[PDB]
Amino acid sequence: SMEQVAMELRLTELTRLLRSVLDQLQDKDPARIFAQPVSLKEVPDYLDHIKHPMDFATMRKRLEAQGYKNLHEFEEDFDLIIDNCMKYNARDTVFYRAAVRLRDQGGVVLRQARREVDSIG
Numbered sequence: 726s727m728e729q730v731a732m733e734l735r736l737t738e739l740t741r742l743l744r745s746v747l748d749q750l751q752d753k754d755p756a757r758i759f760a761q762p763v764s765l766k767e768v769p770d771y772l773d774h775i776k777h778p779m780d781f782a783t784m785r786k787r788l789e790a791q792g793y794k795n796l797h798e799f800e801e802d803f804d805l806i807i808d809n810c811m812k813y814n815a816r817d818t819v820f821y822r823a824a825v826r827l828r829d830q831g832g833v834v835l836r837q838a839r840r841e842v843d844s845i846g
Contacts, residue, residue, distance in 0.1 A: 739842070740791050743799050746838045747788060750803060751781050753830040758823045759806050763813075774813050779805035796842045800835060 754760065762780045763771050771778070784802050786792075793799045810824040 735846075736791050736794075738845070739793070739795070740788060742838065742841060742845075743788055743793055743796070746799070746834060747781070747784060749834045750827070750831050753827050753834075754781070754823065756819075756823060758820060759810070759827065771813070775809045777805055778809060781806070796838060803831065803835070 751760070759781050761782050762778055763775075765771055779802050784799075784806075787802070788799075793802075807824045807828045811821055814820040814824075
């Protein structure tokens with residue numbers, strides 16, 4: 726149908742916008758602390774602690790499969806990265822501190838992406 730195609734074009738354009746948001750968010754992590762999943766070889770008990778792991782590479786696979794239907798879903802995954810980190814790691818650690826900075830700096834980027842999604846529909 727022509728409706729299914731028009732919907733597909735909307736999803737593609739949302740995907741293009743989220744890809745740029747993702748690149749902007751990832752730049753706020755220059756140390757690459759959140760680039761890849763926490764290694765279960767190196768942190769074998771990680772899943773006893775964190776029930777829903779997340780990281781930027783795993784978000785990128787989902788994005789490129791057009792697996793995000795809306796910005797809310799994307800934001801959920803970004804928030805998991807931060808929130809998982811701040812529970813697993815103590816306050817006085819390089820890891821926790823990097824999460825706080827990513828959170829604060831991403832807020833700006835997410836504030837305008839919300840406006841661009843509402844605006845461009």
